[PDB]
Amino acid sequence: PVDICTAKPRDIPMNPMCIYRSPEKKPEATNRRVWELSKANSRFATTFYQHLADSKNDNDNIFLSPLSISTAFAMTKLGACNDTLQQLMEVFKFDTISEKTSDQIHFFFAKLNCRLYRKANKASKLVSANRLFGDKSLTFNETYQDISELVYGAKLQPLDFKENAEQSRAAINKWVSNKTEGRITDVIPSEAINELTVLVLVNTIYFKGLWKSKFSPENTRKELFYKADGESCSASMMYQEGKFRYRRVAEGTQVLELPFKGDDITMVLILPKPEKSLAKVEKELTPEVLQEWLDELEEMMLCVHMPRFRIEDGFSLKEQLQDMGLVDLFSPEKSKLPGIVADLYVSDAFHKAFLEVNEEGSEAAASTAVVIAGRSLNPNRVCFKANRPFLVFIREVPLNTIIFMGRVANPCV
């Protein structure tokens, strides 16, 4: 047979002439390769997140799936070469995994992807909506497709851009929307794709989950949420008391982990103290700093106030991505995707992320009351009130993977 979970480096053609070799640099029961990749992948998430945050206004929420983008450009990378391939490695930090080969990266995703989407449990409803779209006139390589299928679970789909340019756009949106249980409707904006369109990269991940420790709607109370602009608005502040992996870090910033049923996927909230600013924290937050904060998360009983929120971000990666160094892939001239063709470059890359958080969890709203008999909490107990902007992440703990990462700078409606 040979599926994603049995794939061995031997089951992934190297393709000489097209292999990069990133420089050198001189805890588990968990797979090391997955460990290394997740670190390289989180390295890109925080980088990308920072650039993206800087380009945005503080009062704007944000939400994306860096794992998505990262995986999307990884399958694109599958058939990239030379200049194009290098930028792909360096931009997405895959080149930060010591002496690793552009070929091995794909083997790592094999391992990662195998566990993220297959070996996972029922509760870990994780759907990968990443596909490559190119015009029919182009002849695509079947070795690429076959590997892109095995590893990334998706082949490049040919669409009639030249002719049915607009008909294609709707074909794409119809497909992303299918996998995203309808949540990720439009994926490519209007007049985004046209006759000149050659290659289009779309990427999203869909997660559906229930809190392991639900909030009771009965305890939700409209509260003020202070924004960046110094103003205030009313949000539906959820409230509960429970045991959560928590941790007060540098300068009073609070890190809270709220797991979902399944236990492997959790939402981490980062709330700086009223004084310090989220922007200040977004800046200071680095891969190792974030990795550290998470390693220090210790179970603790606390009072949690959390605004109910909904965030939906529409991304056109191309700009920021090339602004970050990925220039060739988007270049009709400098581009080089020899493995994907049988002048091929990426026209644009679209990303859409969606998060709705309520008392039952992320995605759902099936009311549930909560009765806690015979509980007496310390009248001094530590509280976590998120009535000011805070970061958010959805990560697969065992895989040390950041699936989604966002910012809730305004939850109010």
Ligand X SMILES: *[C@@H]1O[C@H](CO)[C@@H](O[C@@H]2O[C@H](CO)[C@@H](O)[C@H](O)[C@H]2NC(C)=O)[C@H](O)[C@H]1NC(C)=O
Ligand Y SMILES: *[C@H]1O[C@H](CO)[C@@H](O[C@@H]2O[C@H](CO)[C@@H](O)[C@H](O)[C@H]2NC(C)=O)[C@H](O)[C@H]1NC(C)=O
Ligand Z SMILES: *[C@@H]1O[C@H](CO)[C@@H](O[C@@H]2O[C@H](CO)[C@@H](O[C@H]3O[C@H](CO)[C@@H](O)[C@H](O)[C@@H]3O)[C@H](O)[C@H]2NC(C)=O)[C@H](O)[C@H]1NC(C)=O
Give residues in contact with ligand Y (CB under 6 A): 16-17, 81-82, 336, 338
Closest CA to 110 of 195, 208, 10, 202: 10
Please indicate if the annotation marks 221 as binding a ligand. Answer: no
Q: Where are the beta strands (DSSP E) in 175-297?
A: 199-210, 221-226, 232-248, 254-259, 265-271
Residue 30 beta carbon to ligand X: minimum distance, rounded to whole angstroms: 23
From ligand X, a second copy, ligand NAG, none, interface partner of 305 (C-beta below 5 to 8 A by class): a second copy
Total residues contacting ligand Z (rule CB under 6 A)?
7
Please indicate if the annotation marks 175 as binding a ligand. Answer: no
Query: What residues contact 352, with CB distance under 8 A and at least 6 apart?
Result: 176, 184, 186, 187, 204, 312, 313, 314, 315
- Binding status of residue 141 toward ligand Z by CB under 6 A: yes
Please indicate if the annotation marks 131 as binding a ligand. Answer: yes
Site for ligand NAG in 5-34 (CB under 6 A): 18
Closest CA to 294 of 246, 362, 242, 262: 246
Q: d(Cα 411, Cα 155) in Å, to the nearest integer?
A: 37
Q: How far is CA 86 from the centre of its chain?
A: 22
Q: Interacting stretch for ligand Z, rule CB under 6 A, among 88-96, 106-114, 138-146, 356-364?
A: 138-146
From ligand X, ligand NAG, ligand Z, none, interface partner of 178 (C-beta below 5 to 8 A by class): ligand NAG
Q: d(Cα 258, Cα 82) in Å, to the nearest integer?
A: 43
Site for ligand NAG in 162-191 (CB under 6 A): 178, 182
What tokens appear for 368 in the block? 């549930």
Q: Are strands 361-362 and 199-210 parallel, antiparallel or unpaired?
A: antiparallel
- Binding status of residue 339 toward ligand X by CB under 6 A: yes
Site for ligand NAG in 246-265 (CB under 6 A): none
Q: Look up tokens 């305004």; give the residue.
A: 410
Torsion of CA 189, 191, 196, 200, to 10 degrees: 10
Q: Which is nearer to a second copy, 267 or 329 (CB)?
A: 267
Provide the mask over 211-250, with x wherever binding to a second copy is found by CB under 8 A and - wherever it is not.
---x-x-x--x-xxxxxx---x--x-x---x-x--x-x--
- Binding status of residue 82 toward ligand NAG by CB under 6 A: yes
Q: Binding site for heparin: what residues are annotated?
A: 35, 115, 131
Q: Which residues here bind ligand NAG, judged by CB under 6 A? A: 18, 81-82, 178, 182
